[PDB]
């Protein structure tokens, strides 16, 4: 038996004032022996030595503390075996601490179809910029004609599609969508026009 190959899908995000969040996927080959953990190392782009942040990580994610806002950090993860750590996986580009994580951008071109006397089927596109955190679903609001007071239609939805139901026969409705990531919900999207029943 031998050492594992390198971890996969090494990404970062959730950049705060003094931390960054690393996320990865297991290696393709364990070496013939089950893995024991992961090694997480950092190295500021203007410094020459990798320093070990943590060892024997069992999760597929790690939050690195104690980062100095306005530096740039490299990161690499390896996988642990009965034989010791395997080859390292690197982040794609340095982590820059000045730009914190925020709320996601508004979703894109909202569309509608399948209108009934009671329901409408709405689709939309994911936003371009998630704000530095992965998107955790979407929120759909509807606003009746005789009002400007929006009401959430159901619960968050991970898909970029939702069938709105519970609509009153013959009434006029416009719909808008917000995306959500870790630090909350986007400024709402480009609203639709008012649509009735059939």
Residue numbers in the entry: -1 to 196
Which sentences from the paper describe this structure?
This 30 kD segment, also termed MGT30, consists of a domain triplet of composition Ig-FnIII-FnIII located in the titin segment at the junction of the I- and A-bands (I/A) and corresponding to domains 4 to 6 in this region of the chain, i.e., tandem I109-I111 also termed I/A4-I/A6,.
No direct contacts exist between I110 and I111, so that the linker sequence acts as an effective hinge permitting the free repositioning of both domains. Accordingly, the structures of I110-I111 and I109-I111 show a different mutual arrangement of these domains. The only common element between all MIR protein fragments which were bound to sera in this ELISA screening is the central FnIII domain, I110, suggesting that this domain may contain the binding epitope(s) for anti-titin antibodies in MG patients.
